Amino acid sequence: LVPTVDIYSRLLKERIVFLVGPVTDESANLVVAQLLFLESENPDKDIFFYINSPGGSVTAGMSIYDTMNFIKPDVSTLCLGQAASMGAFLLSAGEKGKRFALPNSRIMIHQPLISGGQASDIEIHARELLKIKEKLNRLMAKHCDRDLADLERDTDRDNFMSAEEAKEYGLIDQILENRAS
Amino acid sequence: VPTVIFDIYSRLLKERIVFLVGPVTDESANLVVAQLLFLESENPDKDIFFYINSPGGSVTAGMSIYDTMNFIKPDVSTLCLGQAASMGAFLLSAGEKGKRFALPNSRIMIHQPLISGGQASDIEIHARELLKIKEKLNRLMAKHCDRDLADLERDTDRDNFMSAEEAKEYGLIDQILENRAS
Amino acid sequence: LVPTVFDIYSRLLKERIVFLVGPVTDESANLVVAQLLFLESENPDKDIFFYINSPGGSVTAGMSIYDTMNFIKPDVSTLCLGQAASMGAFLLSAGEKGKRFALPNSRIMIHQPLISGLGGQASDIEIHARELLKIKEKLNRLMAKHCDRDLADLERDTDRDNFMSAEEAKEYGLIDQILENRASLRL
Amino acid sequence: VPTVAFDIYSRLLKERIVFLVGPVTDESANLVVAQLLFLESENPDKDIFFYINSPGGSVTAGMSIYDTMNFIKPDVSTLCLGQAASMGAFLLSAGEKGKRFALPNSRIMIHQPLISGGGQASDIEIHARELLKIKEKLNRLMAKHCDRDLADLERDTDRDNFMSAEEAKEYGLIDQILENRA
Amino acid sequence: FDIYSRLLKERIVFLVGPVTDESANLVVAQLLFLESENPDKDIFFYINSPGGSVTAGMSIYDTMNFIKPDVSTLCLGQAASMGAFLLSAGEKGKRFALPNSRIMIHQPLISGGLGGQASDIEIHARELLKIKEKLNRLMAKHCDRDLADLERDTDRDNFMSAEEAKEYGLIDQILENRASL
Amino acid sequence: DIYSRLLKERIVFLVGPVTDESANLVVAQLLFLESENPDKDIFFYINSPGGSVTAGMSIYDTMNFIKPDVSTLCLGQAASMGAFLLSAGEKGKRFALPNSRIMIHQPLISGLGGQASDIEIHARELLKIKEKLNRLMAKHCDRDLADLERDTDRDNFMSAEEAKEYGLIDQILENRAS
Amino acid sequence: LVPTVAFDIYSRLLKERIVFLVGPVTDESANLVVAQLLFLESENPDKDIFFYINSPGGSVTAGMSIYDTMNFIKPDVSTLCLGQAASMGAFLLSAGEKGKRFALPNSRIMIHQPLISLGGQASDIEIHARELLKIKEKLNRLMAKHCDRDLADLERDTDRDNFMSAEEAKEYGLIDQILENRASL
Amino acid sequence: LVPTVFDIYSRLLKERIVFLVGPVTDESANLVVAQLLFLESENPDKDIFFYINSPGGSVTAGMSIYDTMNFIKPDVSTLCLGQAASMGAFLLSAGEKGKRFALPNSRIMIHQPLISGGQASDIEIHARELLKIKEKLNRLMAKHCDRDLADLERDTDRDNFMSAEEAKEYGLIDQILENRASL
Amino acid sequence: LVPTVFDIYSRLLKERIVFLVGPVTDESANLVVAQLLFLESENPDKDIFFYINSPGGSVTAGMSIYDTMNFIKPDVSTLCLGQAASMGAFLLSAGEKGKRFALPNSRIMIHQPLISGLGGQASDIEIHARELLKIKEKLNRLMAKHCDRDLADLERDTDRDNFMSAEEAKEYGLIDQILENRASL
Amino acid sequence: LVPTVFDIYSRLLKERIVFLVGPVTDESANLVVAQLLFLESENPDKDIFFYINSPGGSVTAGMSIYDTMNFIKPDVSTLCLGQAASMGAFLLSAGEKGKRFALPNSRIMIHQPLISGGQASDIEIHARELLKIKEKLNRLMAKHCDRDLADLERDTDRDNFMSAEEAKEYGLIDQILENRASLR
Ligand SMILES: CCCCC[C@H](N)CC(=O)N[C@@H](CCCCC)CC(=O)NCC(=O)O
Ligand SMILES: CCCCC[C@H](N)CC(=O)N[C@@H](CCCCC)CC(=O)NCC(=O)O
Ligand SMILES: CCCCC[C@H](N)CC(=O)N[C@@H](CCCCC)CC(=O)NCC(=O)O
Ligand SMILES: CCCCC[C@H](N)CC(=O)N[C@@H](CCCCC)CC(=O)NCC(=O)O
């Protein structure tokens, strides 16, 4: 269904990587592979990471996040459509100064959720989920240059933000209307 | 259900026998509760004989039976036939001490609570409630069995099957009945 | 599936005992309503004993029970066995004050209204969301009255699932007394 | 279910005939138990006739019947009609010795316990050990019922073992084959 | 009373539809009841059945031979497989069919056979062949025929009219009305 | 294939429901064409019943972000988000074929569940979406917000001529001489 | 589904001697890893292989095919946990050449005893229960070896699901270093 | 997706490596047969390396592999990685004697045949065929393992799991290879 | 589900009316058989009124009714209300000659046997096909007798579904009279 | 799914090897037909090697292969590997006489036609046609096996399994090939 000249491989030659739809092990690892490839091609030029995602798996998302921070090139992020949950986490993780959103994109942040067995096992997994919640708040607070207490308050339930609101919050640096913004 | 000059379960209810058979649900538990209250109304001082063949089930449903057993005036004698596992074993052990029995090839099993959520805040709320249930049931079981809390904690960490003799050794029942001569 | 002695529930209905067991539906709630009206007709002056073991259910169905409990002349005493959660806890706390009881290992739980993500046009979602919040506010106000507490307490205490032991429910003001046996009644 | 002011099974319950038909479940087994207890209270001095046509089923449900047969005062005579397989054959062989019968074309089948339907290796170990304990107990009890050496039962239950009425009598599972009332 | 309980007062017992543990034991129960009511009067066993479980059918068969009353059989509609076996098992001289009844006999079949280790399949195949031999031997006795004839004539489905069943030895008479006796 | 060949003519199709996948494919093609030549018009042919609002906005913001003019053409139909994108084409370069149809309406949601607090949060966000889309649509159509609110309360079907009078498109093309 | 660069992106990274295990370990996904390991050894037995693991675990025998192949071939198999390495995934992570086992800073490890999602005669359940316990004992013995820890430690720490941060995994002995970025040699 | 270098499996085929992975079906077995014939055609004298990670499967499907292994001129060396169970273990044990290998943590399992309906006559026919297969497989397994048939009948009555070392002790394989210096 | 005036069908059985409604199955046919035997036991000389509204069904189930109607002493009068198709029309035509009726807007349909699902070996399919052809001929012969027609007539006229009005059914010989009300008799 | 060397099957087609694997369907049989015609076009005089591992399937699909085998100029040698059951056994037995082979542990099975409704008239028509099929298949098989028709009628009444040796004695194949030295 993807046109040829495929189109995503052609845009990859421009150092553009897309994350579209739910963050899964497969879709996240495909992003990781493209990031490693682009670094191999030129470790010094910026990579442009376009995000339209409702979120997904935390560990899948972390594999992208850690790869973004590991590789040498700056990873610029761009929100188009929406960046929610892990998508918003990855958006805010772009190189500071190079995190963008289009004017009508939507950001949403929230605490982790689950889609059990013995009480002992439920205890273990609840404790792990609470560590994830705590780690994500701390990393998000760092990304946004905000207090940990703010992130805890502001992710207790679904928190939708416009592009201007996400910029004020510290999740992105600039809103781009066109190539003059 | 066979009938007599009343169906067979109503007939045995005339002898103050109440059955708990199969999984403990809100409905099956409350039918037992209703029978216990009925028997107390009929005669508040005569023993009731509570026959249990159950794999367990809902904790709150079992607690409605348990608290009713302790609330009503008559002693509730318990008898394990077939099996008393999980909430079934809890109710077996809750019978009036001295009047908890098992038939010779009955089986007992005890274990910690099991279940089969959304936001982390809610999962935390329900995990903490589940752990309080786990502690409460161990504390109550230790009292029933005349044992230390630490013993019940180790012995319910995984499924713990017991023969009738072992359940007697454990303190969960008082006597094994082979016939009316024992 | 139900022993006769009249079956056992009809027999206890003669003792003026009514059960609410399991989820609260239109059918199970109206059956409670019918028993309440029947007992009032049998004797408008004698207490009724309403035994609740329920995880909750439909709010409008539970409200049909609530309004009937307050409408009829006899006092409706409530007793929690097993659990009274959500609409179950609301009905328990609605018993005649002084006559709300729980058994020692009962569990109470309160929370804000929950839905099974509405559907349709934004105008319709706005209408149903506004009604859902109104329901939430009304239930908090009624619960505040039942518990003899400030509205702000109930707003705080229902934001997420709030489990209570019998002791906690008594201290909250949701029940009056915990009964281990028939010697426990005081006051 | 025909009516004769009773249904047909309630009517034969007046002749002290109790049926076990189809799979043994908690529900079907406890119904048998209730009938055994009912008959005992009606007259503890008369035999009970326990007619078995069953492919087997739950071991613990079967033990609830077994232990009740041994507990109550009346002799429980057993009759195989059609078939008594697995727990059905166990109950058949558990009848009062001297009063265990089969009709001429009935068939018996015995075998070791099987499970139709998981977890951690620790939990699988616990349940496998319990299954072997059941297997050992059933071999010991079957050997006693049949007046045979334990090694005989271990060998002969390793896989499905079908027996004709005559073979079951020679094995010791029943006492006599009844062709008619003569 | 319902209609079947009322006809039970006339010592009429029906076997209708597949032979199962439940349907067969209900027949057994009625046969025992009727014997208890009067051990000397014939019982009239009306069969309209396509067959079913062999061991269930044997419980009826052995009960018919055990009780004191003669059990007269009547085929109405059809008596196939275990139904034809039971029809042929009524007291000799008192086995009847209505004129347009149909009988069918065949060797045993298993719905979904073969399941497990070769050892278990061997055990169950041998039991099935013993059942096959026993049914042929018993049927030959019912029909006053050779075991070899029953083996030949049941290898595949063998449909018989009432007159053919009478000639074969499965029934004694065809009754068009009460004067054909 | 046929679509890659027409992409060489700077023709991009949106056909069927707007999803994350179908919208981003459009985005990728728009970015590709800008990279091939940032100055030449792009021709965005729309035959769509609508779909996801955020997916549609990714197309919308990309149309406005890239340097080339994006001309739009309605063939068959442009409904809901499809009509939104049609009206977003470069002004003066928004077209419909003579028997195409337009339809506009307020946001819809399919289904889930949650606490009253969460439902309130999401209803408020849906109402903000509704107003933003009415405001943007009014700007595209050179009409008032109150007009768009009134005219999208329920499904509003428009012929090509009605859509031109409304301001959603500039011209109806029977052929290249229109 | 997969970008091209003449090669799909994964074939291209295989030219950098990078092999991925992503998602559940199955017979098919494990043998694909085995095939890439043998291919890279054939292409150059003198260069390290970089085995990137993001997996929740899966089949024990399929995982053992990877494990024994890693140990069989000449090249060092360096391992990297990205995302998570759970169960058989953590086993393979810890099996990388010692000194060359890595995790990214926010990856997570989880270890536990074998589980099954049994049926037949009691004899058969006994046979398979014994085989499952042998697997449990072997995996504890091998894991204790990878981690340079006492067997009793692994027996205690795998009784139930045991999650570890990257730092905890390093202290436990499952990995050697946590990699922040290319400050590397 | 299979990596490309040729795809990765074709590339390993050029080094005379053939895989049997997952259940033995008509389709998966014939693909192995086709590779064996191709490799014999490429060089009839050089060993073929048959890597087996399989839980077993169809008996006739396996026999087509077995008979091809015995038919072609090249020695077919076998290697168990992961597991060789049932028909998988049969083919593992069918490798050229002296060239049957296992990796150290692979496992073998052997057992009698199993199946996953009709007139008694037809069930009799199929039960007899199943018992002939059982006896034939026991006879061929006894030859592969250099053991008495009675040993094999006893040892396959139920699932019989073996470590690599037990499989070597049994006679099913020749050596366990930790690496190429294990030779 | 049935008004208990003791339900209405039990009440009409006191007037010696038996209904066949819907598909003829073993269970519904034997229920008819039992009522027929019951009414004969109550009084062997009084007419029985057999009201048929049926689309047909099982041939052997229908034959149990047919043979019982002919076996018992009472005349069995038949009445078609709504429709009598296939085995239903067969039973209608089987009523005591002179006492077979239809209501004015009743519908009759006759046709050859059909089978729902044959599946087995060619040998078994031959056996079952032959039995079906035997059934087809016997039913045509019996129907021809009821209608005072030839077997060849019935074979011709049942080859495909043959719908008949009440008047057409009377002309054919399937019924004796059409009753608008009792004055029709 | 299929290694390249050509994919592996196209590579073996270059050596005039054609496979029939798994159930015989319209699609699988016509692919065999297509290969047979292609090999004849490539060289009408050289043997074709038709390798069969099949449980059977559609009779009409199998007949399209059968008639194509007899129609083309090249001899079609057949080899049973694994099994040739029902239509598979029929096609195996249809190879050029003298050139029908089996591997030592192959299995052959033969039997009468099977069916996995409508008016009685329609059942009569299809029953008669099925019996015609049964008779025709027994007649052709008796010719292939150089045997009396009555033998085939007897020996296909129920599922009839044959070892390779039994199939050779039956006349279904000519030789059993242990390895490349087994040939005449
Ligand atoms: C744990 C208990 C679960 C259910 C009760 C839960 N506490 C609160 C709740 O569900 N309130 C709804 C009424 C309950 C009936 C089923 C949804 C309100 C309503 O009427 N909504 C209609 C609309 O506005 O569309
Ligand atoms: C056309 C239909 C007529 C069917 C009658 C058919 N001739 C005979 C028949 O049903 N025999 C089996 C009984 C059925 C039980 C299966 C659920 C015999 C049996 O139990 N053998 C041992 C075993 O099963 O293991
Ligand atoms: C849609 C119109 C329905 C009318 C039914 C249709 N006229 C005829 C019909 O039902 N024939 C079979 C029903 C008899 C049931 C006995 C088990 C007869 C039969 O037994 N044939 C041989 C075979 O079954 O093999
Ligand atoms: C183990 C069993 C497998 C072998 C099957 C067995 N040899 C015979 C077989 O399949 N015969 C049919 C042809 C196959 C068609 C498949 C869709 C007969 C037919 O063409 N009937 C049409 C009619 O008369 O209406």
Swiss-Prot record, chain H:
Subunit structure comment from the entry: Fourteen ClpP subunits assemble into 2 heptameric rings which stack back to back to give a disk-like structure with a central cavity, resembling the structure of eukaryotic proteasomes.
Subcellular location as annotated: Cytoplasm
Family: Belongs to the peptidase S14 family.
MF-aspect GO terms: ATP-dependent peptidase activity; ATPase binding; serine-type endopeptidase activity
Transit peptide among keywords: no
Key words of the record: Cytoplasm, Hydrolase, Protease, Serine protease
Active site (UniProt): S86 (nucleophile), H111
Matches recorded under Gene3D superfamilies: 2-enoyl-CoA Hydratase, Chain A, domain 1
NCBIfam families (UniProt xref): clpP, PRK00277.1, PRK12553.1
Name of this chain's protein: ATP-dependent Clp protease proteolytic subunit
The species this protein was found in: Neisseria meningitidis serogroup B (strain ATCC BAA-335 / MC58)
Pfam families (alphabetical): CLP_protease
Catalytic activity: Hydrolysis of proteins to small peptides in the presence of ATP and magnesium. alpha-casein is the usual test substrate. In the absence of ATP, only oligopeptides shorter than five residues are hydrolyzed (such as succinyl-Leu-Tyr-|-NHMec, and Leu-Tyr-Leu-|-Tyr-Trp, in which cleavage of the -Tyr-|-Leu- and -Tyr-|-Trp bonds also occurs)
Stretches of the chain forming a coiled coil according to its record: none
UniProt-listed InterPro entries: ClpP (IPR001907), ClpP/crotonase-like_dom_sf (IPR029045), ClpP/TepA (IPR023562), ClpP_His_AS (IPR033135), ClpP_Ser_AS (IPR018215)
One of the GO BP terms on file: protein quality control for misfolded or incompletely synthesized proteins
Enzyme Commission number(s) from the entry: 3.4.21.92
GO cellular component terms, A-Z: cytoplasm; endopeptidase Clp complex
PROSITE patterns the UniProt entry points to: CLP_PROTEASE_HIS, CLP_PROTEASE_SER
Its job: Cleaves peptides in various proteins in a process that requires ATP hydrolysis. Has a chymotrypsin-like activity. Plays a major role in the degradation of misfolded proteins.
Hydrolase among keywords: yes
Chief place where the protein resides: cytoplasm
Curated annotation (Swiss-Prot), chain J:
GO molecular function ontology, one term from the record: ATP-dependent peptidase activity
Annotated PROSITE patterns: CLP_PROTEASE_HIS, CLP_PROTEASE_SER
Signal sequence segment: none
Domain of life: Bacteria
Enzyme class, UniProt record, top EC level: hydrolase
GO annotation, cellular component aspect: cytoplasm; endopeptidase Clp complex
Keywords from the named record: Cytoplasm, Hydrolase, Protease, Serine protease
Pfam families: CLP_protease
Example of a GO biological process term: protein quality control for misfolded or incompletely synthesized proteins
Keyword Protease among record annotations: yes
Residues at the active site: S86, H111
UniProt catalytic activity: Hydrolysis of proteins to small peptides in the presence of ATP and magnesium. alpha-casein is the usual test substrate. In the absence of ATP, only oligopeptides shorter than five residues are hydrolyzed (such as succinyl-Leu-Tyr-|-NHMec, and Leu-Tyr-Leu-|-Tyr-Trp, in which cleavage of the -Tyr-|-Leu- and -Tyr-|-Trp bonds also occurs)
E.C. number: 3.4.21.92
Subcellular compartments: Cytoplasm
SUPFAM superfamilies: ClpP/crotonase
Keyword Protease carried by entry: yes
Record function comment: Cleaves peptides in various proteins in a process that requires ATP hydrolysis. Has a chymotrypsin-like activity. Plays a major role in the degradation of misfolded proteins.
Family in the record: Belongs to the peptidase S14 family.
UniProt subunit comment: Fourteen ClpP subunits assemble into 2 heptameric rings which stack back to back to give a disk-like structure with a central cavity, resembling the structure of eukaryotic proteasomes.
Protein's name in the database: ATP-dependent Clp protease proteolytic subunit
Organism: Neisseria meningitidis serogroup B (strain ATCC BAA-335 / MC58)
Name of the coding gene: clpP
